[PDB]
Structure 1
Amino acid sequence: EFQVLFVLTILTLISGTIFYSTVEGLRPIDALYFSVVTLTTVGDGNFSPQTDFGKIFTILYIFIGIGLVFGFIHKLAVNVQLPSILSNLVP
């Protein structure tokens, strides 16, 4: 479960990294940063896609990607962090 969601998130982020570095001309690390803050809905206070292609892709990327990204964040903290902490509270 967590593994599959992990891989799916990675692929999704790889896709965004490639798209933004190519179409919007961002440095790979910046493309990844934008993909990440966009899908987690944090957003970026400085960059907004400048091309129409970038805008359309971002719209679609958002609708398809948020569900997944949060599904992963959900399991990451519940099935991977909840116990590691919950078990530690055990005297």
Structure 2
Amino acid sequence: MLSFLLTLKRMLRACLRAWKDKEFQVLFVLTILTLISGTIFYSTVEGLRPIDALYFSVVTLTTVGEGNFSPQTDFGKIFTILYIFIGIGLVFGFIHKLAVNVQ
């Protein structure tokens, strides 16, 4: 259905149009930064291969959760707790940004 594609593309444009908005860019960078930080921390303190440090940071920052790994060190547990709250702040950031992009 052509109606289908036209709608999809319209949406894809409204999407990319947002990837131009400065505030969206900031939020995006902050989460990429947060992901890098997490990849580093868990790689160092919990000693995971970088790929597994990133993976854990992702499933954790997004509240999906990891089914097997849990922070072993006390430093990791404390960091992860703060890490999670950073993620919540980020999402509220994005959410809020959408509530504004309506008017």
Q: Given that residues 20 and 31 in structure 1 are in contact (C-alpha distance below 8 angstroms), is that contact kept between their aligned partners in structure 2?
A: yes
Deviations 1:2-42 (A, max 9, x none): 21111111111111000000000011111011011101100
Computing the radius of gyration from Cα coordinates, the structure with the larger value is 2
Gapped regions of structure 1 (runs ≥ 5) = 82-91
Deviation at 1:64, TM superposition (A): 1.9
Runs of 4+ in structure 1 displaced over 4 angstroms?
A: 72-81
Per-residue deviation, residues 38-84 of structure 1 (Å, max 9, x unmatched)? 01100000100111111111111111222214644886999899xxx
- State TM-score, norm by structure 2: 0.66
Structure 2 equivalent of residue 11 of structure 1: 33
In structure 2, what is the equivalent of residue 65 of structure 1?
Answer: 87
Identity across the alignment (%): 99
Residues 80 and 52 (structure 1 numbering): CA distance in 2 closer, same or farther, change over 3 Å? farther
- TM-score, structure 1 normalization: 0.73
Count residues in correspondence: 81
Which structure 2 segments of 5+ residues have no match?
A: 1-22
| Structure with the higher fraction of residues in helix conformation | 2
